A paper describes a structure:
Two CspA orthologous proteins, BGA71 and BGA66, that are capable of binding complement system components C7, C8, and C9 and thus inhibiting the assembly of the MAC have been identified in B. bavariensis, allowing B. bavariensis to escape the attack by the immune system. The importance of BGA71 and BGA66 in the resistance to the immune system was supported by the gain of resistance to complement-mediated killing after expression of either protein in the serum-sensitive B. garinii strain G132. In conclusion, we have solved the crystal structure of the key complement inhibitory protein BGA71 from B. bavariensis. The overall fold of the BGA71 protein looks similar (Cα root-mean-square deviation from 1.66 Ǻ to 2.63 Ǻ) to the previously released crystal structures of the orthologous PFam54 proteins CspA, BBA64, BBA66, and BBA73 of B. burgdorferi.
All three BGA71 constructs were overexpressed in E. coli, but only BGA7162-251 yielded crystals, suggesting that the flexible region present in the other two constructs interfered with the crystal formation, as previously observed for the BBA66 protein of B. burgdorferi. The crystals used for collection of native diffraction data also belonged to the space group P31, but the unit cell size was smaller and only six molecules were found per asymmetric unit with a water content of approximately 45%. The final model of BGA7162-251 was generated for residues 69–251 since the first four residues that remained after cleavage of the His-tag and residues 66–68 were not built due to weak electron density. By surveying the crystal structure of BGA71, we identified cysteine 173 in α-helix D as the residue that forms disulfide bridges, which is responsible for cross-linking of the two monomers. Furthermore, comparative sequence analysis of the PFam54 orthologous proteins reveals that cysteine 173 is not present in any other orthologous PFam54 protein, suggesting that dimerization by cysteine cross-linking is a unique feature of BGA71. The structure of CspA showed the highest similarity to BGA71 among the other PFam54 orthologs of B. burgdorferi, with a Cα root-mean-square deviation of 1.66 Ǻ. While BGA71 did not bind CFH and CFHL-1, an interaction with components C7 and C9 has been demonstrated. However, the lack of binding complement regulators can be explained by the inability of BGA71 to form a homodimer in the same manner as CspA. However, the proposed N-terminal residues 37–63 involved in the binding of C7 and C9 are not visible in the crystal structure of BGA71 since they form a flexible loop region connecting the protein structural domain to the cell surface.
Author numbering:
A (entry chain A): 12 to 194
B (entry chain B): 11 to 126, 134 to 194
The structure:
């Protein structure tokens, strides 16, 4: 059944991410160390994983790219004026992209288990559509995130040289979760 | 660290350890739900199957012997048309729900951590773990009863059926007060 296959493929997809992420991280790259050291907000180990699922998958598990993004975020964080923009990128955009995907699987699982075939069939189309939309969103974010890594390395619009420039760029390309949704 | 954050962490770690242990046990060819897998009427997906095993295997402490005796119990009941449904209800209605409640709370705790409750989610979380602990207690009492043939439950499938019916009536019976 469609919902049963959907859960299965997501389940395996999840597992593969968990292994890959932990690989990369086993090598001492502390991607979110700076956010971990922050006393104002507490990045739990779950929050952290979710964030990485989206980011790492988005950057194809290329340590180099992840490190660049790390520098971007740590530059912004180390400038009090723009700290918030790093946090918003992390907690408001990246994390939401992930949660949506997770929310739907949490709810597709509910239809598989708790609900009988009739209900199951009612809910079916909408959950599938949402699932799709939430994966596509993450793809569009990823596309955008690679364009940003490249832009950074080329110092396009002085984004490597100028934190203020950098801040504006991150603001204008990551305005809202909804902007990454399919049209 | 917020209470919810620590609640999710401890659940997450607990989940992971269960996955590994379950897979270990299963790697040795014990096909705990084979008979249900072979069933065309209903479908056990490999997720559903894992969830069922989480509650059962953790309840029986990952003791292969105990899991094998439970397997007999369930396959006996399944192979008798009259009582098949009792084996299915035990699996899909009781065990799976006990698991689902737990799983549900975490999916919701996580949700509150990120996108946004506290005291109610913590209550529910406690309740749903307790429920599983009461079920586990009951399940061990059943396996011991079965091995002793108490009330002829190993000797008599009908007797067996009535015992399963009277000790696993509903999910709600395992909840705390």
């Amino acid at each position: 059944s469609k919902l049963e296959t959907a859960a299965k493929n997501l389940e395996n997809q999840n597992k593969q991410e968990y292994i890959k992420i932990n690989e990369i991280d086993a090598q001492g790259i502390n991607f979110l160390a700076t956010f971990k050291a922050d006393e104002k907000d507490n990045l739990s180990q779950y929050e952290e994983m979710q964030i990485k699922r989206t980011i790492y998958s988005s950057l194809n598990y290329e340590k180099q790219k992840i490190n660049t993004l790390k520098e971007i975020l740590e530059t912004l964080y180390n400038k009090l004026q723009h700290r918030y923009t790093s946090k918003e990128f992390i907690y408001q955009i990246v994390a939401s992209i992930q949660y949506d995907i997770d929310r739907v699987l949490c709810l597709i699982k509910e239809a598989i288990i708790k609900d009988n075939l009739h209900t199951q069939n009612q809910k079916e189309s909408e959950l599938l559509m949402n699932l799709d939309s939430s994966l596509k969103t993450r793809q569009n974010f990823a596309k955008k995130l690679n364009e940003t890594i490249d832009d950074y390395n080329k110092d396009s619009k002085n984004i490597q040289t100028n934190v203020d420039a950098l801040a504006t760029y991150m603001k204008e390309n990551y305005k809202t979760l909804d902007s990454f949704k399919p049209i």
